[PDB]
Each structure stands twice: as C-alpha cells, then as structure tokens.
Amino acid sequence: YQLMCYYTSWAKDRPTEGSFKPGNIDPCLCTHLIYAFAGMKNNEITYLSEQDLRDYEALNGLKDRNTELKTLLAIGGWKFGPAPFSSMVSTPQNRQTFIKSVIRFLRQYNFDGLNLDWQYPGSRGSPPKDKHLFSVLVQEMRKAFEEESTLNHIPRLLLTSTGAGFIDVIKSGYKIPELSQSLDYIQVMTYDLHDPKNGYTGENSPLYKSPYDIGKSADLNVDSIITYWKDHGAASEKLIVGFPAYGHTFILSDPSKNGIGDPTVSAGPPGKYTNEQGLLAYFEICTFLNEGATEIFDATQEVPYAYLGNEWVGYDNVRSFKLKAQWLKDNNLGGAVVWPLDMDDFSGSFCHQGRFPLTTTLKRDLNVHSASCK
C-alpha cells in the first residue's frame, strides 16, 4: 500500500507552536511526500516564492535518510482555480510548453513526479471541452515522462492527479477509463463532505452515510465516492483514498441539538493556529477536547464529533483512521493520502499520542516498510 503525505508551504508560517517546517517530517513515515503548491507562469510550472526552493531542498533531503521515499510537486488547488489550466490545455503548443517545463523543473529540483490538482476541469467556469483536453494533457504528459526515462536511462517520473469527491463534478470533468490508463495514481478527494451551505451539522469525511442522508447527500461518504470511481472504470490499485488531518466546525442553532444533522447558524470561528473559519487542524481539536468538549464517536458514519456550548466539530481521529484503513485494505485500494500531514500532531505536544498520531496509525495498519528504514 502507498501512504502519501501532503506538506503545505504555509504550515511553516503558522504562529509559535503551530509552525511546522518540511525538514522536520519523519522520513520513514510515508511512502510519498507531496509539496503543495507550485504555480504557473506563461504555461510553465514555477515556484510561488523563492523561499519554496529552500522547502524543496529540505523536503528532498529527507530522501538521503529514506532512500525509497518519493517526492511529488502538486500544482493547482482550490484557490488557484481552473482558468490557468483551461488556457494551458487549450492548444498543443501550450501543453508542450507545460510538459517540457515540468520535466525540467522536477529534474532540476530533485522531485520524483507531479501531482496535477486542477479544481476542476468542466466546472467553476472551465468549459465542457476541458474534460477531453485534461485527458489529452494527462496522456501526453505520461508519454513525455516515458520518453525522458528511456532517453536518460533513469526511473520514470510519477504522474498523479487529484480526483473530485462530488458526483456532478466527477461527471463533468473526468474521463475515468482514460485517466486510469495514463495516471500512476488518482488521489480521491474524500473530504470537505460537510455540506456547509445546507444549515445542518455534517461530517467532514464519513466512511458511511447517515440513515438521514437523502438524495445527493447519500453519496457524501468515502464508501459511495470510491464505489463511483470503481463502477466508472478506475483501477482499484491506482485509487489513493483521501484522509483529512482536520475537521470542519459549525455554530449550533441550539446547544441542546448537538448531533449530526442538527441546525446550524454559520461555520465555526477560526482556530488560533490554522486561522480559517469553519476549519480546525487535528492538533487544534485535541486542545478543544482538552478544554472540555464532549467527544462522541458516531458508529453509523464511523467518525467522531465534539461539541462545547454552541461550537461543534466533525473530524477524524485514531479510531476513524484505523477503521478506514481496514476498509481500504478490504476494498483492494492502492493506499491513503494524508491531507495535510502538517495538521496531524507533528510535535506530539497537543494530543500527547506521540508524533504524527493519525499518520502513524496508517503507517502501522497499511504495513508501510522501507528497506532503508529498518
């Protein structure tokens, strides 16, 4: 099984005890480290800031301790949006400029591959034709990686892509059989399933649906999403399940109605370290629990939630990671991807469950072993 772990460039910029640097990632913990994010300039991949080059060096230097460790560079993300990718895939000339810049960039900065994270082809303004053009880009990029490998007599660069977790978004943007042929891995975005706009508490990444989830809500769970990708032609061993190291928060309409599916006023206030309304890192949730929040493990969805007064959080813990890891193995999936590793308890001081408790649960249960680490 694979165990991929994201490192986000902004994690080192969080205040005081929340700051986490890439050089402090345990090199034996994951099979792949993914750096979020690279940007684009004139149809060429590039760094977002010159300081990212120092992060690339620290991240890639971990391969000197774990010689089997692989590193990927992620381009895109929610904030970047669809427009740069739409322009880049629009012509063969722009795709060639991009593919050539990727090979050159990955090799010069010692990355083992690229993670495409276009959010999303075919939606958010991206036209219907981008479903076909994204598949063309992926085929052409895989072919160029094979040709570079043969020309230089070195292992081929890896090619991965994120995959939407929302059915309508999957339908309008992904030619699943073609993408599965050319990609090494598909990182399925099995998280942010809390449906913030419906006015009820919802889980971030439940394994199974709530019996109260009706219609489109019934597909907002790991089991339903992965089943959809498999039913539509994705290779099971190429599927990498998204494991969030954070939760989503809500302000309860009534503090006495504190279960899943209960009425909400708004997303919860930003955390001291992550500073994003409606989100708390796993390390911040540990503080919330230590400061008196009531912890409930919902067996119907196989995920926890916690509440304190009118503040409610739906998240993942050691137990939910354990149960999803067994389900992953039972379903012959390719592995897991921790999103983001920097929101797990990287120091061991917030949760007192040792360093990286969520990720360590996956390393142990997915039998991740490197010959270089024994």
Residue numbers in the entry: 1 to 374
Paper text:
Individual crystals were harvested from the BAL fluid of mev/mev mice (carrying a defective protein tyrosine phosphatase Ptpn6 gene) developing crystalline pneumonia and C57BL/6J-Tg(CAG-Gal10)Bla mice (transgenically overexpressing Gal10 from the ubiquitous CAG promotor, manuscript in preparation), sensitized and challenged with the allergen house dust mite (HDM). We had hypothesized that the crystals obtained from the BAL fluid of C57BL/6J-Tg(CAG-Gal10)Bla mice were CLCs containing Gal10. However, crystallographic characterization of these crystals revealed that they are Ym2 crystals. Native in vivo isolated Ym1 crystals and recombinant Ym1 crystals as well as native in vivo isolated Ym2 crystals and recombinant Ym2 crystals were crystallographically equivalent, sharing the same monoclinic space group (P21) and unit-cell parameters. Moreover, X-ray crystallographic studies showed that a native in vivo isolated Ym1 crystal and a native in vivo isolated Ym2 crystal are structurally similar to each other, which is not so surprisingly as Ym1 (Chil3) and Ym2 (Chil4) are two closely related proteins sharing 95% nucleotide sequence identity and 91% amino acid sequence identity. (C–E) Structural superposition of the X-ray structures determined from a native in vivo grown Ym1 crystal isolated from the BAL fluid of mev/mev mice (C+E) (yellow), a native in vivo grown Ym2 crystal isolated from the BAL fluid of a C57BL/6J-Tg(CAG-Gal10)Bla mouse (D+E) (blue) and a recombinant Ym1 (C) and Ym2 (D) crystal (grey). The low root-mean-square deviations (RMSDs) establish structural similarity. (F, G) Crystal packing of ex vivo Ym1 (F) and Ym2 (G) crystals revealing their crystallographic equivalence. Here we show by ex vivo X-ray crystallography that Ym2 also crystallizes in vivo and that the phase transition of soluble Ym1/Ym2 to crystalline pseudo-CLC states leads to profound immunostimulatory effects on innate and adaptive type 2 immunity. Given these similarities, we assume that Ym2 crystals most likely will stimulate innate and adaptive immunity and act as a type 2 adjuvant, similar to Ym1 crystals, although we did not formally demonstrate this experimentally.
